[PDB]
Amino acid sequence: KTFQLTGTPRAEFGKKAAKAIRKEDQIPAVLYGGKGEGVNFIVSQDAVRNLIYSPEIFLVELTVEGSGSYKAILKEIQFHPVTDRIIHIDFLQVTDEKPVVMEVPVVLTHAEGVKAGGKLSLEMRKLKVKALYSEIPEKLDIDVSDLQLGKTIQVGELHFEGLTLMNAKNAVVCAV
Amino acid sequence: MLQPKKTKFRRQQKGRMKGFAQRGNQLSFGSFGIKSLQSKWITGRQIEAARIAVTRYMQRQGQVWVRIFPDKPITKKGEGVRMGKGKGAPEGFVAPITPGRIIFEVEGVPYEIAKEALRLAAQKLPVTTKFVVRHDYDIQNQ
Amino acid sequence: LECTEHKESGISRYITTKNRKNTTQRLELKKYNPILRRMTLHKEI
Amino acid sequence: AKIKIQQVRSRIRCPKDQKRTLDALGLRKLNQIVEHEATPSILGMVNKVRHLVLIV
Amino acid sequence: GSSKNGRESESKRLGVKVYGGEMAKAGNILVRQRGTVHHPGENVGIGKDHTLYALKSGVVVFTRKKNDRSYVSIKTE
Amino acid sequence: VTKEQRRQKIKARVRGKISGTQEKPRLTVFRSNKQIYAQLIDDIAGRTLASASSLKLGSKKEIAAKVGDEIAKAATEAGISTVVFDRNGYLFHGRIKELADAARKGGLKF
RNA sequence: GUUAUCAUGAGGUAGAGCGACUGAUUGGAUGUCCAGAUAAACUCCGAAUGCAUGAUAAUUGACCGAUGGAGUGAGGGCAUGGGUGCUAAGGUCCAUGUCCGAGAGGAGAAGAAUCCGGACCACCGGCUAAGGUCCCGAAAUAAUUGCUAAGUUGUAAACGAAGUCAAGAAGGAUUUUGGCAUGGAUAAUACACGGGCAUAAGCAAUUUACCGAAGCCGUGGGAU
RNA sequence: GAGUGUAAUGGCACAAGGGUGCUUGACUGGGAGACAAACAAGUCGCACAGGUAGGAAACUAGAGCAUAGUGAUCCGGUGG
RNA sequence: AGGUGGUUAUAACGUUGGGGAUCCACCUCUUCCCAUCCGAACAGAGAAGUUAAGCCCAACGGUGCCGAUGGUACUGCGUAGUGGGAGAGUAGGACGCCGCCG
Ligand SMILES: [K+]
Ligand SMILES: [K+]
Ligand SMILES: [Mg+2]
Ligand SMILES: [Mg+2]
Ligand SMILES: [Mg+2]
Ligand SMILES: [Mg+2]
Ligand SMILES: [Mg+2]
Ligand SMILES: [Mg+2]
Ligand SMILES: [Mg+2]
Ligand SMILES: [Mg+2]
Ligand SMILES: [Mg+2]
Ligand SMILES: [Mg+2]
Ligand SMILES: [Mg+2]
Ligand SMILES: [Mg+2]
Ligand SMILES: [Mg+2]
Ligand SMILES: [Mg+2]
Ligand code: NA
Ligand code: NA
Ligand code: NA
Ligand code: NA
Known part of the structure; x- marks a missing residue:
């Protein structure tokens, strides 16, 4: 029911920044919901491998380095048309x-x-x-x-x- | 043969397939499918041969989906006919596809049978393909 | 069945068309007589 | 406040727009150097023919 | 072996003639259109073929309004 | 269809040609079941220049004359003539005509 | 006149979308609904470029009027957007650039338009471009790190076997993404890395020096 | 999602769609200025003078929702 | 609780309640101005009656409307680089905001 995820800060944005990110086998990711702006960060293919490729569902306990710690659920996964590889994720923040x-x-x-x-x-x-x-x-x-x-x-x-x-x-x- | 019941126009300009497919690249109905790695026109005769092959496997337990429909009319001039003087004799319909588009969806069979059944269907098609399993699938329940 | 018409009465003339099988009576319209500088009735000829 | 621009590639087989930009910079011969004030109008001319020129 | 086609008519050179920002003399043709793709605003008149023309000299202004309706007007002084 | 959608339809047809400037201000009338009103409006400015009504002032047509005259005096002092009369979705008849006639009969070229 | 920058303006292409229209369309629950999906002559949307106007800047001066003299009115290749054809043609018909035409020099063994480059004349001077530096043939048998064993190379596919190297995944076996090789591979006067020949003198990478044109510079001499 | 005589496209709600009352502006003398453009041709539009129609008035009217419905010169006919 | 404008619905539509001092309205009758088969509409003549409905006020995210950030498609130049950057969807916003007169 619970998953442990962590991610590095992301600063640059655009066509050049994202292509360089995936060159290191990373995925761009965002988190938003309720109060406050979103958070841009980077996760890794190994880290999220068992979160997405699975018949189970979990409540992600996300710890973005440099920003803080939150709780989130999967909202949208972006896949490459041909390789079927993950290229973007957004996590919806969940509260009580x-x-x-x-x-x-x-x-x-x-x-x-x-x-x-x-x-x-x-x-x-x-x-x-x-x-x-x-x-x-x-x-x-x-x-x-x-x-x-x-x-x-x-x-x-x-x-x-x-x-x-x-x-x-x-x-x-x-x-x- | 799969073709429109009727059309607004009898002829059509031969277009241009440009990039990767942005729609129909994800499985919606079954758990297994085959996806194209090339851009090509797929004919109705090709589709019928592949569908019969995959349906022949899996005995009679399972459902097959065709996720492309040929709606593009094509023509051909014929032998002894010079260039010019208008368009040629009609020659059926084709479906243009781009890399990433899923062709055949299968559900209701275990993993190994589905893999083999769609291999026979992909060998009747003019494009090289790739096997896809839905990412929420469970290997320990089939 | 749409022919030329010439309304009359130097002299003042106006050229126009009409359907000879629809409008079977001669045209009679008030127009501006340049010679007299006032409106008078012009009838078909 | 000045800037020196050198032509290093030929203008043969270049589009007329690029050929005319080199004229507006004053460049008519390979290896020739010109000097200009680095204003936004001049900088847009160099950026248009960046594959043909060098900043020296 | 034949075509039942091969016909066409001459194009009419329709469209905007004086853009927003430019100056017009009275009488200048501003837009040639079929129907009122653009509508006459202040100091602008419309002809028989929906041609938009300037009634006074000034600055051409385009302006979108309710239902994305476009108006053309002349700004004088 | 509801006594107002038609009136707004007629209102906008009249406003397609009738407006007000600093010269030739628009004369506007509103008719209620019991009263009658008038207003002089400057559309470019958006503000009212003068007004008259019968709320604080014979049959109903006999009282529209006083409103049609009291609007003349208000505009006479402020220096207004050659106003333009808009119907405001009202047929030119009855009380509205008497108000227009009194305004014309005074100092305004309504 | 041109190009750039800034300001201002109108778009319906690429893309996208289809409970926004028209046409077409897949599977379900059952005209109602839940998913899935299409178009030159569909559009609720919608770029990048291009276009028009004004101002400023740069620009060997490139633009216009009047008037004397013409030639041309068989084009062609390549790249991009397309129609047609069979998503054939060194095919055909348009649009935007470009070069040949009317253009020599250098590389490509030898090629009108591929890559580099616009020849005033002379020189037994120098620096470079594309491309190269074992010999024919100018310059490194240069330095360093891996890959290939096929003479692959130094100038084709569906489909097999996985020969080998690197990085992973699940749990000795299976497998994923990369790199290079292997089979599929095929006619007639005698054949091809241009040849010799090479296990690097092949491939990938980084680095320095050098060679290299009628390009640029230097010296002398002319012309408009 | 109708209609707009007539193909297609664009337009049309203050309707340019549908009704009625009165009317002949389907006017005389006109063309500042533009679009378009090898030429010949084509297109939109004044200012004001004269005299009208509708309207309480403001105002509108030099034919028609727009874009096809066409033919130079020479030579003859008719009215001034 | 009215009249009349500006702002391209973030403004509209709708739902559930409240409102009769004075206003707006429904309301009563057709002798007259005027009107259609019909005083239904339009017009005239009144205040006998009502807040029921329009209308205005409160609350509501219900239908429509607006809409990020990130990622992606596409693309100018150029031969992987260098600039521009959607549409859809998702977080959300929103039950108007302003003038004049009485
Ligand atoms: K060769
Ligand atoms: K050297
Ligand atoms: Mg045309
Ligand atoms: Mg498209
Ligand atoms: Mg599509
Ligand atoms: Mg000829
Ligand atoms: Mg020719
Ligand atoms: Mg050819
Ligand atoms: Mg072609
Ligand atoms: Mg030929
Ligand atoms: Mg040349
Ligand atoms: Mg040597
Ligand atoms: Mg031979
Ligand atoms: Mg020289
Ligand atoms: Mg003129
Ligand atoms: Mg964005
Ligand atoms: Na043609
Ligand atoms: Na559709
Ligand atoms: Na690019
Ligand atoms: Na968007």
Whole structure:
């Protein structure tokens, strides 16, 4: 649920500065949210390798050197069109003042009855949730022990915790 | 064959493919795909041959997406016809693509089967390609 | 069916067109007579 | 407050705009040196033909 | 083997003739346009073909207003 | 469609040609259900030069004459003539005509 | 007149976008909605350059009027933006530059327009450009650090095997991005690094000195 | 997202789109100044004098939302 | 609680409440000026009645509108360098700001 990240200060900006940064296998990155301007800094490909390339989600505990320490979540990753390599990241600062929308994995935790035959199908892999950062689950369990025939559990027909299902209600989260 | 149901114009000027693809370079539907490393016109016959090949693999369990549609009309003059006197006889439609554009998306199969199924499809295509896995994928749950 | 018209009454003349199958009566419009320096009726000829 | 400019590359096969800029600087021959006041108007002329001149 | 095309008409040399900032004499043509791509403002008149022309001598001013509508006017003294 | 969208439509049609300068100031009238008002306006300046009304002053058409005359005296002192009369989305009739007629009959070329 | 700088102005191209229009379009839940996506004759947007005007600066003077005399009105190559053609042609048709035409000298073995460079005349003087410094052939068998084993080199692809070097990743095996090599590689009078030949005299990098033109300078002599 | 007689494009809400009342400015004498431009040709537009139409007035009107609907000279006809 | 301007909606639209001293309005009737099949509109004649609605005030980020920084696309010159730098999206902003008269 938590990740440790640190980064060096970034001063120069533009086409020349960014291209030289990635020549050292670094990534330009910014952090912004709520009060105060943004922070420009540099992280490394090794440092963020397990933050992004992973089926898990974490609340990044970010320590930008020379500026301070904050808490953040992943907001936007910029990938190269051909190499598929990371070229830019922006982290949204999270606080305990107002909720924030994020998408958590949903897990279809046995299957209902004999089941219609190897179906047990997870359709909606992620669900948008807005809440305080310290109320967001690491996972969204579901128990499935009803209507082994043709059935579907919708997004609206579920209540987990002090969450808020903004994930496009009246949709389908599982079927068969 | 994949072609528009109708068009506003019958002929079209041959354009110019310039840079890397900025749209459709990321997987949205499946977990595995193939992406182009060259710029080229892709014909409907090429696409049908590749799609049949990838669908033949994976038996009957999985879904395949074609993420390009040929909407560009092309012509050809023919033998014994000199230069000039207007445009030639119609010859179907092609889809122009640039490096980075994803062609075939696959989901519903384990990692090894998907890798092999899209290798057979990429061998019917005029461009060299590259296998891509979505970065949120889990190797320990398939 | 749109022909030239010449409205009359030195003498004062105005040249214009009209549809001879739509306007079948002779044109009669008040125009400015330069010779008299006042408006008079000009009829088609 | 002055500045000396030398021509080091030929003007053959250069665009007419670059050929005319060298004339506005007074340069008509290779290795010839000219002296000017370093004002923003003169500096924009050198910057336009920077691949052809040297500051000495 | 033939083309059913090959036709074209002469271009009309339309567009802005006196730009914002320049000086105009009365009668000078300012814009040739189809329709009112530009609109007549103060001291500017419009002809039959929507030609914009100067009624008085002065300085040409362009000005955008509500709904990005452009007006052309002459600033006298 | 609501007694005002049409009036604003007619207002802007009249204002397409009628304005006010230091000379020939604009004469503007507003008609309420019970009262009637007038104002002399300098559009280039944006400020009102003179005014009259019947709030503190016969049928309604018989009272528009006094408003149409009291606006003349106010402009007579300030040195105004040859004003331009705008309808303000009002048909030229009834009370509004009497106000215009009184202004013309006095010292203004309304 | 030109070029630069500053000020002022109008754009609808490149790009982008498509619940902003028109046309086209993928998958889902089900006309409603969630994602995905396209265009010379689509546009809610929108540069870089270019263009117009004024002022200042520089500029061998390059611009204009009047009037005497012409030639030309078969163009061509290259780079960039395009149409056409087959994203063929030493093809064809436009636009912007440039050179050949009407241009010699130097490098490229030998090439109209590729790279360097605009020849007033003379010289048994000097400095350089592009490109070079083992011999034919002027100048380093120069210095230092790696790579290649194929004579690759010193002047082609889909697809194989990974031959080898460097830096990583997951956890002896797998793999990723780089560098150089290897197979794929192919006709007819006898063949090619120009040749000799070289394991560096090949490739990559840094450094110094030197060679190198009708370029520049020096000396003498003319012309407009 | 309609319409604007007629292709396409640009324009149009104070509508240039749709109605009615009255009218003939689809005027006589005109062309400061510009656009465009091999020439021949083409395009937009005055100032004011005379006399009108609509309007309470201010004001507008030298044909039409704009851009196609065309043909030199020579030689003849008609009215002054 | 009105009239009339300037500012290209950050100004608009909307939602939920409050308002009748005087004003604005709805309101009552068509003999007259004038009008359409109809006093619905337009016009005239009044104050018998109401705040219900328009209108104005408060609060609201709901629909529209504005919108960074960074990164990217593209591009002038030039043969990797040297200058310019979007669109989309994201943080956010915003329930106007100013004049004159009564
Ligand atoms: K060679
Ligand atoms: K030397
Ligand atoms: Mg044209
Ligand atoms: Mg484009
Ligand atoms: Mg596109
Ligand atoms: Mg000829
Ligand atoms: Mg010719
Ligand atoms: Mg040729
Ligand atoms: Mg071509
Ligand atoms: Mg030829
Ligand atoms: Mg030449
Ligand atoms: Mg030697
Ligand atoms: Mg032979
Ligand atoms: Mg010489
Ligand atoms: Mg003239
Ligand atoms: Mg920016
Ligand atoms: Na043509
Ligand atoms: Na679309
Ligand atoms: Na560049
Ligand atoms: Na932007």
